[PDB]
């Protein structure tokens, strides 16, 4: 993983002892920061690491699909959801805060019980799951206006990993830069990486890099491409391609 930065540093010697816990670990960060990465960090250290490793985002599915992508429902007998998937394993629930009311309540109750109920018919669904969520809302704010439930927080956010968005990684913006330039240089065939100018740095470092990792990874093979050269600097930085 790239980075020097001590917040960032502070967080990976946060999650080596978090990892072997069964507790579920709440991970506050913007999009791009490394939330699903830190994730599956928490699963491969942590004695589960043979077991699975699932994901799902609250916020790509409507309530009824959550619902049943998240607790399974019958009918060739039974769609498993992704805590049955998880069982042995971990379940990373990313864009929490999105999760609707009906959502937190069953969550809680699986947390609490640690079973799946069940249609009549059918006896209750053990599950044995560590858990780990992230978004970046304020939670305590939504506590606040009734749209996440306290009780659900008192039992997900056992410890809290916050991950500082990339605007905030010291000087990791130039070292990620520099990586993904060269990986860039190797994909189309450049004999190396012919820097980054000063003016070139100047926006990379100035911009607030709302995609984080995941936009500055874009934007600087986009950069390099459109450079095409070792001859001389890499001096245009291409944030927006939609201007020209
Ligand atoms: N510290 C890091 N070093 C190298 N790559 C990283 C680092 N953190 C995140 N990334 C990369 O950034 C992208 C976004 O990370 P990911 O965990 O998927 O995103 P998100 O925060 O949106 O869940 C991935 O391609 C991942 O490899």
Known sequence: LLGEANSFLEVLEQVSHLAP?????????????????????????????????????????????????????????????????????????????????????????????????????????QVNVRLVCATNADLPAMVNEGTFRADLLDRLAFDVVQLPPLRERESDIMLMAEYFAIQMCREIKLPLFPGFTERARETLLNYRWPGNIRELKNVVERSVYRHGTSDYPLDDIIIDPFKR
Not at 29 to 45: F, P
Not at 93 to 121: H, N, S
């Open 21 to 125: 816990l069964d507790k579920p670990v709440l991970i506050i960060g913007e999009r791009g920061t490394g939330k699903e990465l830190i994730a599956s960090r928490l699963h491969y250290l942590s004695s589960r690491w043979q077991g699975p490793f699932i994901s799902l985002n609250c916020a790509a599915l409507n309530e009824n699909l959550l619902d049943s992508e998240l607790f399974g429902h019958e009918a060739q007998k039974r769609h498993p959801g992704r805590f049955e998937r998880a069982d042995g394993g971990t379940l990373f629930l990313d864009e929490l805060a999105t999760a609707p009311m009906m959502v937190q309540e069953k969550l809680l109750r699986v947390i609490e019980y640690g079973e799946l109920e069940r249609v009549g018919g059918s006896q209750p669904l």
